[PDB]
Design a protein around this ligand. Structure first.
Ligand code: HEM
Length: 214
């Protein structure tokens, strides 16, 4: 359509369906991804979010990003730090894995942030809106289909606490995506970054399945 949000949802529809069928996300819902596998996901999110969120911070203030900047509602870095300390312990920072597929993903994020910040909005949409779309049904699959000790920790990533309703927030985020000012050339690229974004996730899933199978 002519609304960026709707353009994004339509384009990335097939790649998105590829992830629905990925071997890793099927076991990750069939409720049987090992505690090892879960921790690799969390570790993956951390590195990604750290990247996404440095570059968002670098580009906040810029017309290409300002309008979709909601730091309090969306930031995930602290939430993942809390979680990783529970999953990996007090020295999580030194022990967490950092694989080729995570770095791939993280590489693109710094590139876009540093040279094509006008595309950063493609990664925000894919990350935030999708994560917000699943942090609910997923968190259950997780916890119940996971452990945990009588913890009270380890699943904070799945709650955006400064967002009372995900629905009301998405709508406002899309709204704000739609008044993003953009050349038709840039817009086509942002669209194509949304696909690249999904692809980076897919390659990440395929890598984590490799590591978790032998
Ligand atoms: C088997 C794997 C997946 C399943 C089963 C799944 C499921 C869903 C479903 C049912 C929705 C509808 C939104 C809603 O519930 O209200 C959704 C939305 C969404 N998904 Fe996924 N998803 C998967 C993988 C992914 C991945 C890997 C990404 C990218 C990292 C992604 C990105 C998004 C985004 C950005 C939205 C909403 C954005 C918008 O409204 O335009 N999905 N997902």
């Amino acid at each position: 359509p002519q609304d960026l949000s709707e353009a994004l949802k339509e384009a990335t529809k097939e790649v998105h369906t590829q992830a629905e069928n990925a071997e890793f996300m099927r076991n990750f819902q069939k409720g049987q991804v090992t505690r090892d596998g879960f921790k690799l996901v969390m570790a993956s999110l951390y590195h990604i979010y750290v990247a996404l969120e440095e570059e968002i911070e670098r580009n906040k203030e810029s017309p290409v990003f300002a309008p979709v900047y909601f730091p309090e509602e969306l930031h995930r870095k602290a939430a993942l730090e809390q979680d990783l300390a529970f999953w990996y312990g007090p020295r999580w920072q030194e022990v967490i894995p950092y694989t080729p597929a995570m770095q791939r993903y993280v590489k693109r994020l710094h590139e876009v942030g540093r040279t094509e910040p006008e595309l950063l909005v493609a990664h925000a949409y894919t990350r935030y809106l999708g994560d917000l779309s699943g942090g609910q049904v997923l968190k259950k699959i997780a916890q119940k289909a996971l452990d945990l000790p009588s913890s009270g920790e380890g699943l904070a990533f799945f709650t955006f606490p400064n967002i009372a309703s995900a629905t009301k927030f998405k709508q406002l985020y899309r709204s704000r995506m739609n008044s993003l000012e953009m050349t038709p050339a840039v817009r086509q690229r942002v669209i194509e970054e949304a696909k690249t974004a999904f692809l980076l996730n897919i390659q990440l899933f395929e890598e984590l399945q490799e590591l978790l199978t032998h």
